[PDB]
Amino acid sequence: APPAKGSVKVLRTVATGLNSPWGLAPLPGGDLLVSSRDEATITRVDAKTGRKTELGEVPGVSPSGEGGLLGIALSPDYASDHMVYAYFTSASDNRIVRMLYDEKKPSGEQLGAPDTVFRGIPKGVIHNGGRIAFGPDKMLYAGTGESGDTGLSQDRKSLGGKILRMTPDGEPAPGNPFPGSPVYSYGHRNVQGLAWDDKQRLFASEFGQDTWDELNAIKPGDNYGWPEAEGKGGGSGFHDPVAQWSTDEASPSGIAYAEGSVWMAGLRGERLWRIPLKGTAAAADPQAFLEGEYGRLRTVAPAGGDKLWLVTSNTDGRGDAKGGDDRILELEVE
Template identity: 85%
Template sequence: MTGRTRRVERTVIVRRRAVTAVLAAAALLLTAGCSSDGEGAPQTDGSASPGRTTARSSPTGTDAAPSPPAKGSVKVVRTVATGLDSPWGLAPLPDGDLLVSSRDEATITRVDARSGEKTELGEVPGVAPAGEGGLLGIALSPGYASDRMVYAYFTSASDNRVVRMLYDEDKPAGRQLGAPDTVFKGIPKGVIHNGGRIAFGPDQMLYVGTGESGDTGLSQDRDSLGGKILRLTAEGEPAPGNPFPDSPVYSYGHRNVQGLAWDARQRLFAAEFGQDTWDELNAVEPGDNYGWPEAEGRSDESAFHDPLAQWRTEDASPSGLAHAAGSLWAAGLRGERLWRVPLKGTGAAADPQPFLKGEYGRLRTVVAAGGDKLWLVTSNTDGRGDPAKGDDRILELRVT
């Protein structure tokens, strides 16, 4: 196949996605109102991702207050891999290589962290990509060294669910994933707000960020799995010590949880999309109510846990979240920048500081790689972005 043919096919794929996304956006505007997530379909109000400063016009926002000056530094050490299609989740392997999921292709690929060589493990059966749904977060089992299990969160034809699969490196490429074993199911699905981030915490429990699937009432309903952070055993049972008896719900009142991370003191933090006004970074406490849809951002209601930090929606749409060098780092989709939120010893946060504004387009996932090192995944081939040559990519960063 010639390079010209590949480029033509790539253009057709992107255009098809754009047409599908526009139709989805029109349906959502009729059923759910306007949303500023920076996810899924391009907005009809002109809020789709602006171009990058490296080759196109700079991103702009409507917040009258200027961004605070950036302290510390972020250095892009190298581009680890290019040519990824709709990457979403990232899981570092013990040997340093990386597993990355494709939302739309429903595949998991191994990336050699030294050479950037990509090897497809296989396609995950049962994934039904549409809108913001598809194959989303991935995580390794706490016992991966012995059980070789990879966990994944995906949208099926009926719900969002968590599965686990055996990764058998001895099998041929493309057939290295075992049949998915469903660990947990029944999470509400929608064209929008499917959540999708999963991570094993310091307590070896599985934490799952969910969205309210466009039905805002689910967030305040403790009997619903939508708009929650769930805490499960590795087998998918409600974890011991959860705040509500026999329930997987750990916290509620969330809109669309997209990032989970723990600091050095084992405190849990979550990044969450707002609707039209405020995106949130939350310090998560068991049993607490984070306010949606009654509150977006900070409020005067004592019943709601206020966010640790908040952003205008055009500046962030925080998807991934990681902790490194004493700060939380949030990857911004619509905002097209990496946010640093320095933590104080009390658990409070200093003012967020932006880096890489517009340089790499939409940023989907950020993962700590030890010390002052981060992995950063772009998201420009997801139907909303403006793909440049080489997109999508994984970057290695050094931060202070």
């Protein structure tokens, strides 16, 4: 369905001056919530003006290296329950909490005390994963990393190097591949992107080491090969990527599905990748857009129809931040 050749138009800059923006949760009314990894804040961005409101600081966050306040996601029933979920690196682990958001409260006081729904994910200075999202099945999904310990990914008993699927209350999701376990898929290095297509099939981005970054089509119980395999050609028993990229051209974090393609934000690549899909295969060659125009790109989210939100990441410790960084852009895509 999507054309082989795509396009990306930057309609406008929506907001500026964000610090280490990471998680992005589009609100029903058109506004955005954005987390800061290193400041541990969640901030509301007014879509029209770019005006920023600090909701508050998430308690218990311990930023260091790639860890800190990471993915955020609205409850599937957010419109009525006003619950915001957050994945973050604590003193001891990575974990997921939920907080009651009340926009009628003073700035800084808008987040209720966190309810911890899931704990115990391995942490390190690197490879903490951190992207969370609710699937069309109303279950909570989380990408993790192996924390720099390559031995965790293949170990079904370790929460490191996995995609997890749980109830919103933090219990293993009914119908998961392994009895009593929140593990959905394994053999992952570091996963910071999740998105579903129109047929409710999950895709995930992944950072490779020095050779191949990945876009994977995720099936429950499948083994994506890390650390014995990296990129395509993993061998029998391993599930290969839909597409792979050199680490200098990608190093991908967030992904979004829109207009029949996966859109993938590249950090080191400083570019937005388009992967048009036919079923769970690439329909045509992936194409990159915006290379070096806005620096590092971390997060991309659907804004409805042919529109995307895109978040830069030049303030995350590995960029050269320019005046006004980091920013959110509005894109119109094909």
